[PDB]
Design a protein around this ligand. Structure first.
Ligand SMILES: *[C@@H]1O[C@H](CO)[C@@H](O)[C@H](O)[C@H]1NC(C)=O
Ligand SMILES: Cc1cc(C(=O)O)c(C)n1CC1CC1
Length: 360
């Protein structure tokens, strides 16, 4: 319990229910690296689904019940044993309380029951951190898992530009998107988009952006143009437009991807049709990562990675994620490094064909 809660001093930057948003902080004064981690936790795209999320997932919509401290785990750990990558860095955990994939900039009003301000939350956290040491940082790594991973892709360049416009050109802004690299593919079996689970990837974001007034990166916006900004929530479409360095971590068989595709791998037989579907999904994911030079994509069926305590255990081609991220750091001090790889994408075609996949 090393990270201390700070509620945002600008109380107009709010969680869904209007309570102040905020962040958890552990300073490391002998370090110029800052890690800002964006929590995940799905989203809600209408008043009905958000009302239900407020009833039984309230911490994802309100700061009123947040604990005063948080323990940093995984890449947020300060223990070298647990975090061989960035154990000495300044650590920031930003709770997800906007249900908007970190894309909203809409104040709650007489007209709107809920505020969706995820993008403004990130900007306001960054602004208040400047006075707490971030002003002297050498690297600001914006990281996130699941909806937070998509949040990284939607916000990393805005953070970069915010810091330039504020007068801090020296801070190198980078992104680490964990489990937020999704495919807008066809479902294995069609379900009507009623809720977050039974909703096709494409339909979910289309309703979402409208409901949150979601904003997306400018260059991507300008490619897909008006009405079609939902495209920018899918990594393989928004990533090529990003200016900042972004490392992508993505299971080939992400449980949340399989959920929105209406696939449930129990322990019972999988018939030819499901086998084909699952193998094609892994192949398409690989294809989208071919031109992402810094990436870690193991052939596993799993949910999320980088803040779990044993994130160090998985390897692709003999390299762990902490090592790959270290190599990525070195690559940014183009031409590949001897024995320090950064592009690590499994090629085998079925869940757990990588023996180091998390086991449960
Ligand atoms: C506080 O946040 C609100 C909400 O976006 C914004 O309109 C205002 O400019 C902010 N004030 C300061 C001083 O940053
Ligand atoms: C943007 C996002 C966050 C999550 C999540 O599980 O947090 C998922 C699945 N997406 C993709 C959306 C099309 C369905």
């Amino acid at each position: 319990e090393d990270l201390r809660l700070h509620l945002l001093l600008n109380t107009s930057v709010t969680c869904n229910d209007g309570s102040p948003a905020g962040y958890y902080l552990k300073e490391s004064r002998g370090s110029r690296r800052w890690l800002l981690f964006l929590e995940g936790g799905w989203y809600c795209f209408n008043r009905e689904n958000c009302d239900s999320r407020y009833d039984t997932m309230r911490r994802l919509m309100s700061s009123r019940d947040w604990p005063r401290t948080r323990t940093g785990t995984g890449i947020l750990s300060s223990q070298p044993e647990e975090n061989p990558y960035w154990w000495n860095a300044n650590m920031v955990f930003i709770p997800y309380c906007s249900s908007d994939v970190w894309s909203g900039a809409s104040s709650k009003s007489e007209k709107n029951e809920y505020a969706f301000m995820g993008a403004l939350i990130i900007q306001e956290v960054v602004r208040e951190l400047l006075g707490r040491g971030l002003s002297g940082a050498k690297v600001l790594l914006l990281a996130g898992s699941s909806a937070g991973g998509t949040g990284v892709l939607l916000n990393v360049d805005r953070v970069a530009e915010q810091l330039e416009k504020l007068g801090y050109p020296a801070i190198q802004v980078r992104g680490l998107a964990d489990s937020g690299w999704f495919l807008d593919n066809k479902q294995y079996r069609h379900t009507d988009c009623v809720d977050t689970i039974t909703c096709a990837p494409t339909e979910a974001i289309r309703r979402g952006i409208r409901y949150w007034n979601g904003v997306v990166p400018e260059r991507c916006r300008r490619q897909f143009q008006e009405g079609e900004e939902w495209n920018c929530f899918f990594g393989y479409k928004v990533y090529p437009t990003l200016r900042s360095p972004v490392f992508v971590v993505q299971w080939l068989f992400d449980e949340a991807q399989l959920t929105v595709d209406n696939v449930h791998l129990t322990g019972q037989p999988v018939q030819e049709g499901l086998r084909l579907y699952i193998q094609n999904l892994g192949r398409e994911l690989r294809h989208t990562l071919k031109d992402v030079p810094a990436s870690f994509a193991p052939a596993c069926l799993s949910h999320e990675i980088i803040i779990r305590s044993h994130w160090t255990d998985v390897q692709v081609k003999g390299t762990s994620l902490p090592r790959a991220l270290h190599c990525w750091d070195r690559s940014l001090h183009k031409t590949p490094l001897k024995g320090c790889p950064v592009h690590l994408v499994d090629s085998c075609p079925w869940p757990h064909c990588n023996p180091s996949c998390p086991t449960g």
